[PDB]
Design a protein around this nucleic acid. Structure first.
Lengths: 257, 171, 185
RNA sequence: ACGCAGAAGUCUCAAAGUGUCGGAUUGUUCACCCGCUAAUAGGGAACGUGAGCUGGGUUUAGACCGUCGUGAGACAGGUUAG
RNA sequence: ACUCUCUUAAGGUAGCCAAAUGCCUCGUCAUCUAAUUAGUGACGCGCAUGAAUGGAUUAACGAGAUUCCCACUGUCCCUACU
RNA sequence: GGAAAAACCGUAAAUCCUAUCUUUUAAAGGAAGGAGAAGUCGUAACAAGGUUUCCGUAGGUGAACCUGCGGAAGGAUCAU
RNA sequence: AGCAUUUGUCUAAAAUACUUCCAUUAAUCAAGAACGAAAGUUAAGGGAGUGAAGACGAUCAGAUACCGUCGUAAUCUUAAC
RNA sequence: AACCUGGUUGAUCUUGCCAGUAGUCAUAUGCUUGUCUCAAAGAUUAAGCCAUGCAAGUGAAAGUAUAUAUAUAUAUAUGUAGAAACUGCGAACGGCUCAUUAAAACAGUUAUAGUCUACUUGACAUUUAUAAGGAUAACUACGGAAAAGCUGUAGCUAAUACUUGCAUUAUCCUUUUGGAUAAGUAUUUGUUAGAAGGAAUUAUAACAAAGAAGUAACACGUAAAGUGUGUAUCAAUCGAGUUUCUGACCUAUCAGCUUUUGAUGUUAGGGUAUUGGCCUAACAUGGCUAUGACGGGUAACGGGGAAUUAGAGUUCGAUUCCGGAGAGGGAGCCUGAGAAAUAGCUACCACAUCUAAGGAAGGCAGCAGGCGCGUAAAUUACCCAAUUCUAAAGAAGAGAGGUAGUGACAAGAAAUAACAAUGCAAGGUUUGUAUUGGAAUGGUGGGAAUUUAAAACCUUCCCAGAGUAACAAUUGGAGGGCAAGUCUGGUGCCAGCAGCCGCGGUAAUUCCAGCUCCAAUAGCGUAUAUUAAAAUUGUUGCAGUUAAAACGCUCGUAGUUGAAUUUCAAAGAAUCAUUCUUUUUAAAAUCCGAUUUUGUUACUUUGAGUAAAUUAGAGUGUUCAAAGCAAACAGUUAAAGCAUUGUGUUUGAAUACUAUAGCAUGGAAUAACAAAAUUGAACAAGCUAAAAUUUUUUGUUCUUAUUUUGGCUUAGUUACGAUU
């Protein structure tokens, strides 16, 4: 009749995935969970198609059934569980820790994170609500509630967040001069510093961002994620660091290696 | 229910298309009368429950001057703003004017003020006479067919005068 | 659903198919370069037309444009790799300058004749079809194989062929000759 | 009795005991169809039956068209009204 | 058609039809029906249609002549009671 | 509490009656148009085609057409 | 479209002249409307001449035509179209 | 490939058509098909019908076992498996078709502060107690019917089926401590107070009434104090319903439509999950229409897109992704979070099956296959290995999906010999080409290695294995258009051919054969559809004296088009009498003599936000190519790198188009528009009624007044105020 569509075709599925034309009829469809469908990776894609620790979906199932992999200090066998923009995967058996980051080619990549530094993540809040007794809960990009947050923090602030206790290590006020990562839009998968904020009334708030090649571009506010400060980047970016080379420059650079 | 089968904005005529769906939605009207409490639970989309009062006699009436509420029987339905048929047939709606038993309110006023928290500014003489004779006019404000209860407020002054004139060549 | 695999046509014959001059020139191209079909010329024409169209797009576009310098550098690199362009041929008027004999010259049968491995282009074609050549130690039976500039030094006879001395091809006949001669003697 | 295998059916004798219809079209006997049927046979009775009816037709006087007749008119010519 | 002709004065034109006008005839074809000497529209070598002897067509109109369909019904099945 | 069964509003299939529109499709008979064969009768048009032509129109004609009326030259006159 | 006697009346018109006034009012225009030869229709006059129809004489192979003579409708005015 | 020839004539130039000619992931058909890779495939005709089969189920740490099987301990205990069955959860996806539906559905673009949302995710609760209460299925028996996924009694007994129910926090007193008092989340009513969003009746806080549901009486098991299943509220997520703006094919031989009967507005209700004439009552008398309403047509699902494209364009979009519709026709429900489901149900109509003729059950536009229709379309194959989906989710299922079979739909690649001798030909001792005779090679037949879910194909190796390499290339043409014969017979305006012009009526270059030649080639004819051709529909870009075409003439509403006019410039710097760039030259408002702002729209510039496939286009030797999205690199069987022998490495999976509208955005020109004298407005002064400030007596209330601010009336004063 009508209701929930449970399938995702190969062609229909996000270009970000890198699921090739001949390689199947379908893609995996994500469970509801940490991030939106278009803005996430399931464990099947991560294990097989990125890491290549399995040949097939069955070999992924053989890895998953075991107690070996834990994400957010939680063991998971759930194949289509979505891992979102930024969080820490630990695989106990291989002793491996991966932090999820955007590539410059607009796809999600697992970037190796230090064993100690696996403890924490940097987490953007999307909204912050007052519940009964005038009692705060923050609501995160990764779909988590952080209860009892101090009123100093505001609705676009990022926060460094422990994974063991689930609570805040430090926080960064949203402002001009903060290192920002673009998460959707035209400029998707790049890092810059906020050059200027101008309010838009009744309509989309736009933010001006400067690259580290000293080039300035606009981006919509909703899809800019604060990621560090002018003083320092707050987390371990991959080597590219969101910096834009043009195709001619990039291909010449590739050739000159 | 559906609007697409009705006439076009120009006054034009539109062919019937799309066979009827569940979620266009719309069901028979409430018939709620005066009698001992009886209600049927109605199951709406998503498992959302509504309560269909089929009979009631005692609703929650608010004396809004002190802002206080007590449960009280309605003696009669006396005027209805929407049409004369509903009041004559005795079917409640959220703009019926009913008559309530004044005794819980009368007791509360006596307890609070000591003659007949609290504002204590003295009730108007016409309204006070009406409370004394038990013929207290009140307006229904909840939707009994949706919420399972007919709850209302005690009317006064300009609302009282308007509805009294509405209630009753000649004068 | 249908297969998402692509496919594309390689040839067309231009209007007026009885254009005398065109016909005579094409016949001379078949004769000279050991082709089997007008369709062979037409595929080479399609390649040349693709080159002409690209070159038109580049030369129409201005200096200091990102698409233009990227596509132009990429085309010139590719043409150098294919061996179409000469040493100082690195500008758009040489891309326009390309001609059908030069494209034909890149073919493996033409190179096999040129190197002297076969005594004619048609002989070279049959030599290649009968599985006797190798390019960089890879056997190939295709006469229309287009040789890259680096590849040209690496063209020789197959070591797994009878020419390469691995075994005679007609073991039966060679054995018959040995057996008959030994029986009589 | 048969050119009667059965089933049909035909010629026929004693036989008038018993039956022999619904409609369409007609001024109509007759006729010509359709349907049922057991078969829808043929005839007499002052051409059975007007102090039984009916009055549609032939066949009083009015009228009409055609032909024929100079004409008046005629017409086992048609037609309407009696 | 066109041409000529005898007779006679000229030899049926526009139209029109088995008509209240077609003997033969219940003419032939459709259609209407269940069955059509009926009805209708046609056809038309017309016994003997036809142009003020008026031909052709008509809305309104009719105690007009005629066919058919609906409604209605003891006309009738088939009579019975008052 | 509770089956069968009824009653009341409300959805409302379907059926039938009309009314209007739509689509093919039948029909005796009528009346056109074209195609074909070097068909019959004239000699209309083409030259001043042996009455210059054509137009509008009306009436006549076995026709082709003719005549009238009023235009034009696309006239044979761009000249007292 | 069409408009030729005389004199008068009622009307319009273009150019010229203007150190006169207005101050963009315009251009071309589906819809719609106005005027619109000749003939025809319908009604009154008028019916001279000309003269569709029609009639005769020829002409001619035939001629229902050209030509000749006669001749109704029409031509003219008023009123409609 | 930004293009043309032949055809009105005795000859000519034109108009104009016809004809050739090329393409078409666009179909049929004719002939031919030695091969290989690749792969469209019952839409167009009947949203016509279906025989038989199958297409949706589910139990490997965690609900229920005295059918049963089995290993230990003193028949019985622990336990472990277990047909079956209740229970739980799914089957609303997918697959299929395109009849519809023409401002609707759909597309871009909003809005939802008008709402609902299972699974999943993260927060995380408030008004008999050593742990409850039974009752029901499978099961046992007797049975009934021709038949059926028909089912009747009685006895039982479980659940994670069903029904109950068992001290915690905050406020006030004491002072930390010790006492006292209270105590409902959604949701609804009546009264108020009032983190964030442009905007609040939102978050939130208090009051007075009601008020669901609830918060574990369930199952496993971490010492080299753990877990499952399941639960109210809140948020997320997978979504969905609505909803804004802008966007359509043909039609005037369709000009007025809509309103009894909700048409259009308002008010009041009701309903709905919620806004809503969605539905009812009452009140208005509207609303919509040439910028084509309202009808009518469509061989009309919409879009991403497809074909041809020099540029415009023109034709096409059942059909691999998305959105909608639909499941014989309508209608109505149930179940559930989600369906007006159709391998859910019910009824009617249209169909239609078995019947023992009492009654019973039914829905291929799922996959095969069949029938009918037609010019027209494959196997009742094998498999869940991959791809994913469904569950109590590893190990089971899945006609979803894959693999084959049939496949000259389309696309790529590629044979039908090569070679040396003689003989022959021309050229000065060369090049070119009826006889011989040795090498090479696949197709074809076989065995393996291999490939594989398995099998087949591919590749590799080894056997076999061409001389007329009979291991046999065809189609259509040869007067012109138009590449090839004044070639041979036969027929004799006949037979016939031939897009077109034409040939044939007796010495045929057009027919019928034969011969030779020519074109393309494992493909080539033919037809229909469609594009180029066609500047023959014309924005670019037509034609209208005589070829087709100026309305008889004029006015005129819609329509389109509509004069000049307003801030000129100057100098510097950079750069090759040039070019790109910077500074200053009125006035008002504002801030510390200086500092910084100044009409709206069209048009234009940058941008934001854009699904892939396709398309353009980079990277990348599939054995090349069509392709794919991969790959490359070192190493007989290793060093390097970084870790205190473990551990390969470099990677790639680009870039862009992605409405015209909308959103943000700089703008000087050019356009528009607004501002714009039967006298207008800029300012100073005075009078005047309104509000606030300062004052100021009266105890949780309470007077009056000066003053200050805004509104309005009147004499003056500006560079005062009208372009031609």
């Amino acid at each position: 009749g009508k209701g929930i569509k449970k399938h995702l075709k190969r062609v229909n599925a996000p270009s970000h995935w890198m699921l090739n034309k001949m390689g199947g009829q379908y893609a995996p469809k994500t469970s509801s969970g940490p991030h939106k469908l278009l803005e996430s990776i399931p464990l099947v894609i991560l294990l097989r198609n990125r890491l290549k620790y399995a040949l097939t979906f069955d070999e992924v199932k053989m890895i998953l059934i075991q107690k070996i992999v834990k994400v957010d200090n939680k063991v998971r066998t759930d194949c289509t569980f979505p891992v979102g923009l930024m969080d820490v995967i630990h695989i106990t058996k291989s002793n491996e820790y991966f932090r999820l980051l955007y590539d410059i080619k607009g796809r999600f990549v697992p970037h190796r994170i230090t064993n100690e530094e696996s403890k924490y993540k940097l987490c953007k809040v999307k909204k912050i609500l007052l519940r009964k007794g005038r009692l705060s809960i923050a609501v995160t990009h990764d779909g988590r509630s952080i209860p009892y947050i101090h009123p100093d923090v505001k609705v676009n602030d990022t926060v460094r967040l422990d994974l063991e206790t689930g609570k805040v290590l430090e926080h960064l006020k949203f402002q001009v001069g903060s290192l920002v990562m673009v998460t959707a839009g035209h400029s998707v998968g790049r890092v810059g510093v906020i050059s200027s904020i101008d309010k838009n009334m009744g309509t989309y708030d736009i933010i001006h961002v400067k690259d580290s090649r000293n080039k300035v571009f606009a981006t919509r506010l909703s899809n800019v994620f604060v990621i560090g400060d002018n003083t320092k980047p707050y987390i371990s970016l991959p080597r590219e660091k969101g910096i834009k080379l043009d195709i001619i420059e990039e291909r010449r650079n590739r050739l000159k290696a | 229910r559906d609007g697409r089968h009705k006439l076009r904005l120009t006054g034009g005529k539109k062919k019937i298309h799309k066979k009827k769906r569940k979620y266009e939605l719309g069901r028979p009207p409430s018939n709620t009368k005066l009698g001992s409490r009886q209600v049927h639970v109605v199951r709406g989309r998503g498992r959302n429950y509504k309560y269909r009062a089929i009979k009631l006699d005692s609703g929650s009436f608010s004396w809004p001057t002190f802002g206080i509420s007590k449960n009280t029987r309605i003696i009669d339905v006396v005027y209805n703003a929407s049409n004369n048929e509903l009041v004559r047939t005795k079917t409640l709606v959220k703009n019926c004017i009913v008559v309530i038993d004044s005794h819980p309110f009368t007791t509360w006023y006596e307890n609070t003020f000591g003659t007949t928290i609290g504002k204590s500014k003295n009730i108007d003489p016409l309204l006070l006479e009406q409370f004394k004779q038990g013929r207290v006019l009140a307006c229904i404000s909840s939707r009994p067919g949706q919420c399972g209860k007919a709850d209302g407020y005690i009317i006064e002054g300009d609302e009282l005068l308007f509805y009294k004139r509405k209630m009753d060549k000649r004068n | 659903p249908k297969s998402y695999r692509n496919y594309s046509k390689t040839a067309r014959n231009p209007k007026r198919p009885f254009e005398k001059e065109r016909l005579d020139q094409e016949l001379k191209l078949i004769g000279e370069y050991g082709l089997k079909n007008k369709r062979e010329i037409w595929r080479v024409q399609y390649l040349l037309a693709k080159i002409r169209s690209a070159a038109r797009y580049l030369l129409t576009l201005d200096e200091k444009s990102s698409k233009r310098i990227f596509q132009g550098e990429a085309l010139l690199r590719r043409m150098v790799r294919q061996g179409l362009l000469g040493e100082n041929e690195e500008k758009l008027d040489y891309v326009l300058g390309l001609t059908l004999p030069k494209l034909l010259e890149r073919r493996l049968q033409t190179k096999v004749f040129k190197l002297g491995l076969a005594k004619s282009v048609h002989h070279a074609r049959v030599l290649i079809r009968q599985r006797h050549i190798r390019v960089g130690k890879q056997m190939v039976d295709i006469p229309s194989f287009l040789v890259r500039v680096d590849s040209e030094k690496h063209i020789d006879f197959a070591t797994t062929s009878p020419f390469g001395g691995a075994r005679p091809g007609r073991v039966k006949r060679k054995s018959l000759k040995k057996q008959k001669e030994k029986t009589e003697a």
